[PDB]
């Protein structure tokens, strides 16, 4: 009887609650007759205790049909992406405006006629880039969840206070469930697919951005139990960021753990005169650039422009600072070595800036492809080490500029001395050059 008759008799609207009273009465006589007919022993059974719980049996329904509808669209293995325009953001269906009784103090303001104001346009400027949402690709599930939450919040405003409070805390529960379901269910696909990590990061930064202004948009329309400041969503903002960051860097360390491995065949960049040591060195360098090319293609038009460029610069910094350390730790560099080391460095500069592709159109790529040193911090030392590889001793002395030139700011004096000793043989000219360098 409970699982087939009393479950479906529970109303879905608070207006129909009173009509349930007869069901409470009609059950009791059904309880009494079986007591007079000796079909029961006691007085209180589970058939009557379930009927008296109609209060909770109401809430535990209204607070689950909005939760199950969320988790239904959260465990789907089908992935979709939608682009977010900074100007156009989803708005609530028309906000509940207050009554006209508060318009007595409003019509006295909308009666002034001014013409000296429209004739003057202040030139004051603002840095509005710090309060918008940059272009990104968010999963359609997150957008549908946000629209469901907006609909639930709108519906809570046109009902009794019990339903409003239950729906508001069910909306809070929706994000609480989101914070724990997606990372656990997609555990396999957040390690092997670089695109999904960026998609998850974008979803978190979208939800965190919306949660900041979600509370204020319904501050004066809910019940007075929630109109003073307790109803808010700021507390969850710090957590979601940490959810969107740690997941992304887990992809970074996985990628770095490849590049260095692809450099394991570099053989410490020694004995370049050997043909095998040249071939095995070219093998590592081709694959290092190829990995970054494919990764940038995968991340193209997914991450925002700033973070994509910063992550690419960060990966390239680790790619270049290992080769720089290998070169600066060498001992013998002959004339043949000074040519092949420059040849290996040539490919990196030829196809380095060519990896950056923050947008889809080819014309927009070259604008960002020329600001590589702004993002990559160790670009200048590698440029200097390039042109030192075939520079003469007197040219090195000139470019040192007595500790004031680009080479002085690039490396350290002892490093330059060691590199010169590895480059030039034991001559009095080398001693004079070392005396020039302090």
């Amino acid at each position: 009887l409970i699982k087939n008759c009393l479950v479906y008799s529970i109303p879905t609207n608070s207006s129909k609650l009173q009509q349930y009273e007869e069901i409470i009465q009609s059950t009791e006589e059904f309880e009494n007759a079986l007591k007079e007919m000796r079909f029961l022993k006691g007085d209180t059974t589970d058939l009557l205790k379930y009927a008296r719980n109609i209060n909770s049996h109401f809430a535990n329904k209204k607070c689950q049909d909005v939760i199950v509808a969320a988790r239904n669209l959260m465990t789907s293995e089908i992935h979709n992406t939608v682009k977010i325009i900074p100007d156009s953001k989803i708005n609530v269906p028309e906000l509940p405006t207050p009554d006209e009784d508060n318009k007595l103090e409003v019509q006295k303001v909308s009666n002034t006629q001014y013409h000296e104001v429209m004739n003057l346009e202040p030139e004051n400027t603002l840095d509005q880039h710090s309060f918008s949402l940059p272009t990104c690709r968010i999963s359609e599930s997150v957008k549908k969840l946000m629209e469901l939450a907006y609909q639930t919040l709108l519906e809570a405003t046109t009902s009794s206070d019990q339903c409003a409070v239950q729906l508001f805390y069910s909306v809070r529960n929706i994000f609480h469930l989101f914070h724990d379901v997606v990372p656990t269910y997609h555990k396999e696909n957040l390690q092997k697919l670089p695109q999904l990590a960026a998609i998850h990061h974008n979803n978190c930064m979208y939800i965190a951005h919306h949660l900041l202004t979600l509370g204020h948009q319904f501050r004066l329309r809910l019940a007075p139990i929630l109109c003073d400041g307790t109803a808010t969503f700021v507390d969850l903002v710090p957590g979601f960021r940490r959810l969107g960051t740690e997941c992304f860097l887990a992809q970074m360390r996985a990628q770095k753990g490849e590049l260095l491995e692809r450099l394991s065949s570099a053989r410490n960049f020694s004995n370049m005169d050997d043909e095998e040591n040249y071939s095995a060195a070219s093998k590592a360098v081709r694959q290092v650039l190829h990995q970054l090319k494919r990764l940038g293609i995968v991340w193209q038009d997914v991450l925002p422009v700033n973070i994509y460029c910063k992550a690419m610069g960060t990966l390239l910094n680790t790619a270049i600072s290992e080769v720089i350390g290998k070169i600066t730790a060498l001992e013998d560099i002959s004339t043949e070595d000074g040519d092949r080391l420059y040849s290996l460095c040539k490919t990196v500069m030829d196809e380095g800036p060519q990896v950056f592709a923050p947008l889809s159109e080819e014309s927009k790529n070259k604008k960002y492809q020329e600001e590589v040193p702004v993002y990559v911090p160790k670009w200048m030392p590698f440029k200097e080490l390039m042109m030192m590889l075939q520079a003469s001793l007197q040219e090195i002395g000139d470019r040192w500029a007595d500790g004031k030139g680009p080479l002085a700011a690039a490396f350290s004096s002892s490093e330059v001395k060691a590199l010169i000793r590895a480059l030039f043989q034991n001559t009095e000219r080398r001693a004079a050059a070392l005396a020039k360098i302090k």
């Binding site: 699982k3 608070s14 609650l17 009173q18 009273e21 409470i24 008296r52 719980n53 109609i54 209060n55 909770s56 049996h57 809430a59 535990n60 329904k61 607070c63 689950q64 939760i67 988790r71 465990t75 202040p122 400027t125 603002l126 710090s130 309060f131 009794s160 019990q162 409070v165 239950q166 805390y169 809070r172 529960n173 609480h176 469930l177 724990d180 379901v181 990372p183 656990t184 269910y185 900041l212 202004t213 509370g215 139990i225 003073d228 400041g229 307790t230 808010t232 700021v234 507390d235 969850l236 710090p238 957590g239 960021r241 960051t245 992304f248 860097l249 970074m252 360390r253 973070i307 960060t314």
Partner: protein, 336 residues
Amino acid sequence: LFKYHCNADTGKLLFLTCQKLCQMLADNVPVTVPVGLNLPSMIHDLASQAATICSPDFLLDALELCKHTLMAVELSRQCQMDDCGILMKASFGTHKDPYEEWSYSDFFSEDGIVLESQMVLPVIYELISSLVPLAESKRYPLESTSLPYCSLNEGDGLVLPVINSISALLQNLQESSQWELALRFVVGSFGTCLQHSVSNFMNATLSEKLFGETTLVKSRHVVMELKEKAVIFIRENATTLLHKVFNCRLVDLDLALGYCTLLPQKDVFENLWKLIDKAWQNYDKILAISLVGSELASLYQEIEMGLKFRELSTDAQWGIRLGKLGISFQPVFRQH
């Protein structure tokens, strides 16, 4: 079982295991933890796995457990912990992190007094045991143990010990300057406490014939008293958090704007001007305050204050521009 036997029974088993783990930790039983596994992290992961694939009837209890296991994990992360390896938080601020400081430094962070773990975990896990009682009996549809059917007589109620447990941890978090955590633990606990009384007792026509009138009056009084406490506490939390946000070098404007919405309507700007009166030691702080004030005035649809905030922002920008050189903008700043 979670890898090979994904179904409702596995979810129920995982929920029961996670329930028993919290009870065992609450009873101060020393259990040998293998080295390399975080205990609160493993509790939270088990709760999440139970919540993902559980039946719709167990979904609410699993979600309630997940809401609090994450809070326990966050409390543990602020404490120096062992038996998993090295989990000392001060090891993070001692040196600069290459990978992290372009996706972390853009957001506000708070570093206060290090929390001692002996006073945190036993209280919070006992709270978890109290909030989610051990349930093994048959569950009829539309029933739970976190939004239950219970009477509130003179002194009868499960919320009463929970209030004292929250109060014990709240004062501890106050003196440790853990305001960022305190706001979340206040809001999450207040929501559950409000629901525990709301879920039954505002359908007056139906409630009187099932529980009487005096119980309704008692619930009405208790809700008002708890709300009056919470309103006063939230304002004091938010003011200090707002004070601490702006003192940083790279001020997080996005989070400061969110923190500004907690205060009442008319007293935000009144505070902000006071904040600009403790200002003019650094123009960058003035610009950061002016941007937030302009954004909040626009959000509040207050056109009049927006012009003043924009003029102040322009004055701060000109002051910074002149401070780059040797020109001083002091004598005329914030005048006509």
